[PDB]
Each structure stands twice: as structure tokens, then as C-alpha cells.
Amino acid sequence: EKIIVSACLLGQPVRYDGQSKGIVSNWLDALGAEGRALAFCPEVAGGLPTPRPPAERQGEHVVTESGLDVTAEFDRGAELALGLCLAQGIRFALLKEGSPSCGSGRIYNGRFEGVSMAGEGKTTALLRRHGIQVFSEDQLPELALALSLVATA
Numbered sequence: 001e002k003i004i005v006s007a008c009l010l011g012q013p014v015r016y017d018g019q020s021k022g023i024v025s026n027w028l029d030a031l032g033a034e035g036r037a038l039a040f041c042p043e044v045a046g047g048l049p050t051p052r053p054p055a056e057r058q059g060e061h062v063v064t065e066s067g068l069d070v071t072a073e074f075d076r077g078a079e080l081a082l083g084l085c086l087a088q089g090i091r092f093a094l095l096k097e098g099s100p101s102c103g104s105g106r107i108y109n110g111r112f113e114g115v116s117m118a119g120e121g122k123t124t125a126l127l128r129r130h131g132i133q134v135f136s137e138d139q140l141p142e143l144a145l146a147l148s149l150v151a152t153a
Ligand code: SF4
Pocket: 005, 006, 007, 008, 009, 014, 015, 016, 040, 041, 042, 043, 044, 096, 099, 101, 102
């Protein structure tokens, strides 16, 4: 089976600051070598540029510090992630922690003050609502196990 992965976790320079969040993982490298780790960046897919200003959720809305509302792009990117999972038969996602799109256990609190809180990004929320299990880069053993359990079926 294949998984969808935040493109930044695969070393792609698609982060809001033009950086990457490439993780060191023999398991993830091997999965990619087998063609089973499909890269996806909801913000770029949703039409946002790179670089782009930091954004935080404010409930259903997603805004930048200047007040620009980018919810349209965030929601488009989330739908496109779901569309790729449905088309490819994907039921597991490995998404970047803390992001207003990809966060799964934590997100910034919407006050633009460097304070995190329990929560999830727009893309994680939509995927979970449709039965797709989302794991962060802090849960690689858990994700690898979940994917391994269905291997011989
Ligand atoms: S939207 Fe998600 S995949 Fe794209 S750069 Fe941000 S954290 Fe990574």
C-alpha cells in the first residue's frame, strides 16, 4: 500500500519560508524507493506561493498576521489531498506536525505569538473525517507498523 506524505518531510523546499523538513528515516527512504510515498503539499496545491507568509487557524478560518484570509486556498489544498487519497486508494498519511494544513497533534493558537495548542490542520482534519489515518513525523514507528499489518492481504 501507498501513503501520502507532506512534501516538506521528503526534503522538498515547499515550506512557507522556502525551507524543507526532510527527516532522517531508513524506513521512509525505503518506502520512497519502492514508489509508495506520494509527495503532496496542500498549500502549494491550493495555489499559494513559496515563500508565503506564516498563517494560523482561527477556528474555520486560516489567516496571515496581516489579516489576509487564505481559507480558500487551505480548503482547496485539503480537498485535493483527499482526492489524491481516494484516487490512489490511500488510507495512511504522514503529515508535518504543527502546520495549519498538516498538523495532527498540535497547531499554533491563531494569536501569532509562538504558542501551540492541541489541534489539527485543515488537511489532517478532512482526511481523518474520511477515515484516513494521519500520523506525524514523531510517530514513524506507529505509522510503519500500521502499514506493515496490511502487507500480506
Ligand atoms: S503545507 Fe504541509 S506539506 Fe506543504 S510545506 Fe507546509 S507543512 Fe509541508
